[PDB]
């Protein structure tokens, strides 16, 4: 997730954890604050998608 | 029996003996029912006769 959309051709580098919950946690990792970067999965014998 | 459906509604009744005038009114009742795009509509009014 992000704070909003992106303007065209804009690049983001921020890695701070967004408050995905409801309580203001002041940027502490854990519940209600999920890390906004998760990776792909590349298996060579899986679906084409 | 009554089951396996998605509606229930109870409110002020429509058909009322509102005459209370020893006749000469007869409480004319006219009702229209129609179904368009999933909407059931009822129109009515009570008038002297």
């Amino acid at each position: 997730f992000r704070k909003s959309n992106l303007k065209p051709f804009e690049r983001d580098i921020s890695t701070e954890i967004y408050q995905a919950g409801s309580t203001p946690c002041n940027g502490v990792e854990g519940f209600n604050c999920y890390f906004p970067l998760q990776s792909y999965g590349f298996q060579p014998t899986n679906g084409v998608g | 029996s009554a089951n396996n459906c998605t509606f229930e509604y109870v409110s002020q009744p429509f058909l009322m003996d509102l005459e209370g005038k020893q006749g000469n009114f007869k409480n004319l009742r006219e009702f229209v029912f129609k179904n368009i795009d999933g909407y059931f509509k009822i129109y009515s009014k009570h008038t002297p006769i």
């Binding site: 997730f1 409801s22 | 998605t6 509606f7």
Partner: protein
């Protein structure tokens, strides 16, 4: 559940639930999109399950 209003935000902030995992639906769009039926199923399940 039908013919309701759904304050899923209130249920998101009124108690402490282990997992707010909605599959294919974002918690943000709970107050925006309108549906027709709600199925509420709830029982006791093992933690390993």
């Amino acid at each position: 559940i039908s013919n309701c209003v759904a304050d899923y935000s209130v249920l998101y902030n009124s108690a402490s639930f282990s997992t707010f995992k909605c599959y294919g639906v974002s918690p943000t769009k709970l107050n925006d999109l309108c549906f027709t039926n709600v199925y509420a199923d709830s029982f006791v399940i093992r933690g390993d399950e």
